Amino acid sequence: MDQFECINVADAHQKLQEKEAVLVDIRDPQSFAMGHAVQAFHLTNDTLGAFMRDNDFDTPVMVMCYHGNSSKGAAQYLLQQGYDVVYSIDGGFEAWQRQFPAEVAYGA
Ligand code: NA
Numbered sequence: 001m002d003q004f005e006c007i008n009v010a011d012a013h014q015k016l017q018e019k020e021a022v023l024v025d026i027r028d029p030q031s032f033a034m035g036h037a038v039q040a041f042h043l044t045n046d047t048l049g050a051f052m053r054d055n056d057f058d059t060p061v062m063v064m065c066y067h068g069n070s071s072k073g074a075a076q077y078l079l080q081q082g083y084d085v086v087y088s089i090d091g092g093f094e095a096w097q098r099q100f101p102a103e104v105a106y107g108a
Contacts, residue, residue: 004075004086009095012062012087013103021060021085024051026074027093029108031066037096038105040064043074052081060085067092 007015015021016039024043025036032042043051043063055061061083063071071088078086089096097104 001084002079004072004079004088006068006072006090007062007087008090009099012064012089012096013100015060015062021062021087022055023062023064023089025064025093026071027065031093033107035097035104035106036093037064037100038103040105042108057082057084059083060087062087062089064089064096065092067094 012023016023023037023040025032025040026043027036029042029044036042041051061078063075063078063086065071065074068088068090069092071092075086075088
């Protein structure tokens with residue numbers, strides 16, 4: 001569709017466990033290596049090209065950032081590129097680590 005939706009980390013974790021959506025983390029590389037959701041793909045300007053060749057526009061994509069704010073602009077951007085199903089995770093990594101502390105990974 002032509003709008004994205006904001007979802008909470010419990011909802012995102014369920015879509016992930018169900019293999020219904022992919023998770024992309026748009027934080028800087030240092031922040032990403034210091035700890036990120038298991039299974040998140042590090043999506044930056046430099047990795048965008050690859051991401052799009054690898055994930056069709058019909059793939060639900062959930063976007064995670066620092067606190068749930070920048071993921072909005074990034075989600076809208078992905079819609080503009082042709083992605084139809086895009087979400088922004090309210091609370092960002094902070095909420096994810098709080099709710100699912102055992103599901104954090106380190107490094108790239
Ligand atoms: Na943010």
